[PDB]
Amino acid sequence: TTKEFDPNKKVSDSDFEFILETGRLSPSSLGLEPWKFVVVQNPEFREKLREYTWGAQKQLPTASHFVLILARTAKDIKYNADYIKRHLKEVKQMPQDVSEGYISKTEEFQKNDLHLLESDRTLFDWASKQTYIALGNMMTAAAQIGVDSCPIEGFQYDHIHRILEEEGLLENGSFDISVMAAFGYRVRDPRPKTRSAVEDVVKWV
């Protein structure tokens, strides 16, 4: 938990590549990797975002690196989307017949196991969940090399969506904003962590 960074201490290229790499190598439901990591270093772009990111008033100006994590939309991660076909063939190297079975399974999973086809937002939120795995792993990776981080949800979706859309970063409706993340070196010690009593959040069966 850091809210503010040292604006003059930058995470090295190769430390940041390690953070991004732990994101890329994160697991995802069905191996679909329904994410994109947009690293926003451009000062002016940060300032546009900051106007609608109440939760990053200090983080955006000071962060060494700032990441928008995008999740795939229903357009791309519904069972029968082309993104999934390309993904299974080109990344997972799945034969055509193996991929047909995999897609069938994906279909049954989405429709009847988790009821993801209720709405386009339900599918989006499923893909977004996968991005929170990457988020956690990227923050943990950072911490392991002495790099502080802050997850950021405090933004006005409508504005952020507009800004990213105009910028072309959502790739004709393939993506939407999932969550943001600032990385850098803290300028002060964090609030000491408070957490629920162990017996309130753990039960053994």
Added chain:
Amino acid sequence: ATTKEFDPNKKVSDSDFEFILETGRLSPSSLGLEPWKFVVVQNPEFREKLREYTWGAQKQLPTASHFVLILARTAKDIKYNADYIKRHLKEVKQMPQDVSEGYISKTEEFQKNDLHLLESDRTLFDWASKQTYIALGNMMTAAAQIGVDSCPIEGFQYDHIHRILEEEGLLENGSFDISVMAAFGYRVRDPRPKTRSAVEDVVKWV
């Protein structure tokens, strides 16, 4: 790091598993609400009841050293005006009554207007569930740091799993619902190497 099957005769030590569980509990959450519960299911009978409707853990449930159900808080507890939040801010975060009133107002504006979380009970639940996926990742990474393999599991029939957890009393009068499951143990063999999109396809710099 992708394991579908474990050694049923190699158990994670209580101490090693506590390290895993603790990194989960210490995970960050939006607004610090920690909207989760970790149910560790070691009872082989209970595993078998889950297994009947958990297609995605046919081999994991029998063989895992440890099996975890991660629950998320429902609309009942993490809607801005819910009592869970007041108790949480007061008793865990030690917020003065005046500070907590402001925090709740902010939570309300955040949920209604910033992220549109009150579109349905399911959208609000899915927000809390996303917090649980942070913990899930952290638990998996912690495991890997100490040589422990892990498998996340979404491959289950919601309706059946919900019913089973509900009947067992684990959802605490609608306070929780199933978010995601996780198996922990020692692999029976090395996994294939990971395939992933090339870095230039999933990273973009502005």
